[model samples]
Target: GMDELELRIRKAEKLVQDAKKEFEMGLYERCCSTAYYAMFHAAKAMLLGYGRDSKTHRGTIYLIWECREELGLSDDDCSKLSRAFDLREESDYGIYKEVSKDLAIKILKDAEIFVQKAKNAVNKNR
Candidate 1:
């Protein structure tokens, strides 16, 4: 039970660390991608803990509303996730793009916050 949620969070935390390291190495794109992926796992872990899963990244980001109260998330949180998704998709699929320094930092912080919120929600009943 705890294993599933915590494991995913562990994975996400590691990814966030990787992003931070990449940031220092001047790998902005890499950091953005890694940070975005960290959020990806973090968000899914939150949903899975509640016996829910989205069919797509956009769906999950959108469906944050469904679990907002549980996750203690806000509209801003969802918007950040949605924005990160767009840039991530562009980097992963489209043309040239850049995630600035502060934006990248936000990615890291937001991802960590998101994961922590997930863990909190999942742990409430346990």
Candidate 2:
């Protein structure tokens, strides 16, 4: 009774909840990082449902293309997702510099939007 996409969606939702909780606890970076994972897993779930391989990081647009070459999602969506990933990197690794609370909130919001888009894509194909 459990499809891969459904399972992944459930996990993604859990991650989102965790992120929200972390944000409430003042763990801004953790919140952003968790939200990023939520988006990534949601996208991966949609991709996997379409028989596409999952990717960890690097060139996410290519990964999205590899998932459903015909989906034709807008470049804006791709750019936003890429920015989400970049924010996650900055939060987790601090390689790109520290993330402010405002930036973290914005990234979390974008992640939520991305997860919703991924879910919609998966459901639309069904």
Candidate 3:
């Protein structure tokens, strides 16, 4: 197997760690945004494990859900996916004042779950 796959998984896990750090440090917006990237990379890593890839974030999310059974994802992951998808927009791209510490913390908590699910999925497939 290509080492790239392992590298991707490591990167995804590290991003999740970073997201947690950001949250604890009160970097609310960064926490939320980084959380999304964690999931993004996590999904990419899973796809790589499955001998597949998606070109876009939306595509990745769609494909991951499309093959959830094969990937061994939980219903909690699906919930986190929708939560993270919605939070990503308001946290990173919306008006500076639009995002709040409250929302960021909530999504970051959800992200923690999502990243774990992705981590577990790829690890199991491996």
Candidate 4:
């Protein structure tokens, strides 16, 4: 379980780097999508800290919301994950041009924070 949790955390970190590179390469839509996955993996890592995993995006978000207190996540932090999810879904399914550079930048920053927080919280849990 620790191995899987550690792998997810590392994957989240890698995805954040990938998101940054995508942003710098002018792949705004891809940046948004990658950033969301970074947060998603980070969130999954947090859940894995409690020996839990979700089968759906909605389930993951709900579990994160329910575990916010234990995970040391604030309302603003939770909202960032939700926002990233929305942006990723829109950019992945809608017009690529809809994902602005500003939006991508915001999600990337949020992903960075979210991943770092998840890592810290999981370590704390251990």
Estimate candidate 2's alpha-carbon lDDT, on a 0 to 1 scale: 0.74
Estimate, for each residue in 12-120, the C-alpha lDDT of model 2 and write its tens digit.
8889889888888888888888988887787777677666674466645568755544544566666667777877888888865766778878877777777777778
Task: Give the runs in model 3 whose Cα sits over 4 Å from its true position.
Answer: 124-126
Locate the minimum summed-lDDT window of 10 residues in model 2.
Answer: 65-74
lDDT of 3 by residue, 4-111 (tens): 767776776787889888878888888888888877777888888888889987888888888788988866676677668777877778885666678887777776
Pairs with backbone N, CA or C atoms under 3 Å apart (clashes), candidate 2: none
Which stretches of candidate 4 lie above 4 Å from their native place?
124-126
Q: Point out the higher-scoring one by lDDT: 2 or 4.
A: 4
Given candidate 3, what's the lDDT at residue 6? 73
> Which residue pairs clash in candidate 1?
none
TM-score, prediction 2: 0.82
Alpha-carbon TM-score of each model against the true structure: 0.84, 0.82, 0.84, 0.93
RMSD in angstroms between candidate 2 and the native structure over all alpha carbons:
2.8
Which pairs of residues clash in candidate 4, taking residues 3 or more apart in a chain or in different chains? Answer: none
Tens digit per residue, CA lDDT, model 4, 4-96: 888899899999999999999999999999999999999998998877789999899989999999999999999999999999999899864
For TM-score, the strongest prediction is 4
**What overall lDDT, based on C-alpha atoms, would model 4 receive against the true structure?**
0.91
Task: State the C-alpha lDDT per candidate.
Answer: 0.77, 0.74, 0.77, 0.91
Instruction: List the candidates ranked by TM-score, beginning with the highest.
Output: 4, 1, 3, 2
Which candidate would rank higher by TM-score, 2 or 3?
Answer: 3
